Predict the 3D structure of the following.
Amino acid sequence: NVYHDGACPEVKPVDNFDWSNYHGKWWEVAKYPNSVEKYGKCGWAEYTPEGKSVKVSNYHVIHGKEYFIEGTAYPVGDSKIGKIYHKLTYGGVTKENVFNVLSTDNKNYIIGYYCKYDEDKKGHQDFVWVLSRSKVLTGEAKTAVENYLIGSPVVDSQKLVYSDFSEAACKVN
Amino acid sequence: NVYHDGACPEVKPVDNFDWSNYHGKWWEVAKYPNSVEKYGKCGWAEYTPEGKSVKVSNYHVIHGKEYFIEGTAYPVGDSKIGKIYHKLTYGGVTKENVFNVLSTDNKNYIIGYYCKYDEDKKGHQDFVWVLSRSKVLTGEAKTAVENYLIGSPVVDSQKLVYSDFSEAACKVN
Amino acid sequence: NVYHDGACPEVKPVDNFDWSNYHGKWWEVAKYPNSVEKYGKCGWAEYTPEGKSVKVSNYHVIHGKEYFIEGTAYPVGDSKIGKIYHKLTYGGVTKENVFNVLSTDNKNYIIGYYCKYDEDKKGHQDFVWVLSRSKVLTGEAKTAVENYLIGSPVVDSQKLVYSDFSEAACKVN
Amino acid sequence: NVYHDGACPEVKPVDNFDWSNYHGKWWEVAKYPNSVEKYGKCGWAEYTPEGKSVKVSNYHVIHGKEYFIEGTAYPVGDSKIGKIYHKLTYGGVTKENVFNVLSTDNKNYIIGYYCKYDEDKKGHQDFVWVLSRSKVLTGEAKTAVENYLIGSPVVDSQKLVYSDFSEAACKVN
Ligand SMILES: C=Cc1c(/C=c2\[nH]/c(=C\C3=NC(=O)C(CCC(=O)O)=C3C)c(C=C)c2C)[nH]c(/C=C2\NC(=O)C(CCC(=O)O)=C2C)c1C
Ligand SMILES: C=Cc1c(/C=c2\[nH]/c(=C\C3=NC(=O)C(CCC(=O)O)=C3C)c(C=C)c2C)[nH]c(/C=C2\NC(=O)C(CCC(=O)O)=C2C)c1C
Ligand SMILES: C=Cc1c(/C=c2\[nH]/c(=C\C3=NC(=O)C(CCC(=O)O)=C3C)c(C=C)c2C)[nH]c(/C=C2\NC(=O)C(CCC(=O)O)=C2C)c1C
Ligand SMILES: C=Cc1c(/C=c2\[nH]/c(=C\C3=NC(=O)C(CCC(=O)O)=C3C)c(C=C)c2C)[nH]c(/C=C2\NC(=O)C(CCC(=O)O)=C2C)c1C
């Protein structure tokens, strides 16, 4: 889990988000570690569209067993601004969590960020995911991701943990 | 927070621990991040000997405000072996958590490990602290710590975060 | 610069090195600092295969000006064994310096070590490079470089300095 | 060796320097590594007044053998201001090098800094020494050293290397 002092940074999302492409199975190729996804392997997100909204379900495997959450996702304002609410319930509190699409090709990959702010302690936790339609980044998508990561003012490439997509890791029994 | 798969690893504690030095104020010079201490600055532990035991108090400061837990510590067996129970209560459950002393000069520094196992997920969380009687490592202590870190089978120094002992950080109001 | 007392340590190279992949452009993702590359950013190596040998060109960029050296590398013995001579001239003097490939995937990354021994002062300087066909370590190659760095007796990951591959740093006129 | 891009930092020397006390024998308790002092142990300096100047002799010991340089030191202006010229020869070139006294008690210790700028590369090398009358810092002096290092804009405590004052380190054959 990646903590910092202070408020959530001012982040600039993509201005050209293609809401059409937001569907299907996205593999979580990397992330910053977090407590909810603790121990999880072979992670993915599954987006099923309903207009300018999507039904969300996020899965991962731990030792042969599948775990998931369901929720819904829709743009905060204009579909083209890469800022999307993901409405999930944690701890019996349901909140609209702003996912920011920092980088995308509207085809193969998403690099997105969520910041959880603590008012009482005046700090925040950073959550980052690299979601891809492929278990492995190749070619242009991989090239795009690298160049983003090298300039990124928000994402620390070192802190990224890359998911295991072994058949062993991915097995549900 | 540092997560790995599998049960808690077997570690070798120091076999020459001087329990009589185990008192006084020990600054948290560095640690693996964990959720209980998120956003805290200027941490320290204070061990107040009570013959057999020591009373434990662990502090930090967040934005002029002090937070703490109190507990009790005692050797798991032979006092010269670097296995010390720390009896703390979290979430209404009281546990005798084993703290392994991985390296120490028996005067200025102590490098310690606690492993938290998840029986359901067949994985564990690693907790590491570098404790020092001075806010900054100097002389032989600094060298000893450096060298241990570099050889350690358990501690990945690259996951250490060193504390903020600024005047401002430490200011309590 | 990383100095240690005593002779060069006995390192264990890879015994499955694939000479046939020793070509192309290998970004200097990290190194131990040394005097010759001081100030240089965006560094790379270029290995031009000439069959038995390779032509070596090592570059970096300092303030829009590009600096480099050229040499020749060829295996110290058996191709499969991860010891390569790098024949370079410094101080009007051509040596055949042994580069030890400590870890590799024979595809994306290479972790290498050269040790410069001072006979008169019975000390040595350590040279470590982390080389990759991409400017940012991603996926399995990232995991593999980390997990090596953690277990390595030779390399202290805390003495690594990661290169800057920003557009600005890589800008040459 | 500690290298940075850019011009030398603006540094604030002590304005209460006691030139009278800048005499006699000072151990080098710590430094930033540098190439001149490569492999050296048990190092010390000796200042021998000659009027408004002091004659300088800097020593260390490498495997029973003694190595040294001589030169002269005198103030840049007013002796109350801790910037001192240290006139030494290296590479057949004799230069006046500014040594800035960042912190001192004028009794036990001195923390000093020299910055070596590369005009060609537009970068600089940092040189930091922690001098003391005593081979081990203790008491108020230690505390003074610790405190300075907590807030120091220039000196990184982690980059200090602490000299070896073992009799074996100090033994001259
Ligand atoms: C494919 C990416 C992805 C993902 C992403 C994700 N989560 C989000 C939201 C959050 N994730 C989090 O972990 C928290 C909780 C923060 C907190 O309150 O602790 C939030 C809000 C957002 C955008 C806001 C996104 C894109 N989340 C998961 C995984 C999961 N998230 C879960 O809640 C579970 C079930 C855990 C269990 O019941 O044991 C899984 C597997 C995956 C695999
Ligand atoms: C000086 C070192 C040190 C430390 C040490 C410490 N904690 C220990 C134990 C634990 N810490 C933890 O965070 C958990 C896991 C609790 C859980 O189950 O989530 C355990 C068992 C152990 C013994 C192994 C040790 C040495 N612990 C702290 C700090 C703290 N630990 C605390 O519980 C709090 C209270 C936070 C609050 O009330 O909001 C502080 C400040 C410091 C500053
Ligand atoms: C991508 C990795 C890499 C590299 C690698 C490298 N160098 C090596 C060799 C050495 N480097 C050194 O610095 C010395 C010691 C020279 C000495 O001081 O005697 C040697 C032998 C070896 C072989 C083990 C390897 C793999 N070397 C460089 C960079 C350079 N090496 C150079 O000599 C120069 C030109 C400096 C100038 O003209 O001002 C550059 C840019 C890069 C960027
Ligand atoms: C007690 C502290 C101290 C010290 C200090 C020192 N050096 C200074 C100067 C420099 N040191 C350096 O290494 C260089 C050389 C920069 C260059 O390489 O051009 C400079 C100018 C300055 C003031 C700026 C100070 C206070 N310098 C030494 C040690 C030495 N300095 C030496 O030149 C040698 C002889 C090396 C040999 O003959 O092989 C020793 C032992 C000690 C032990």
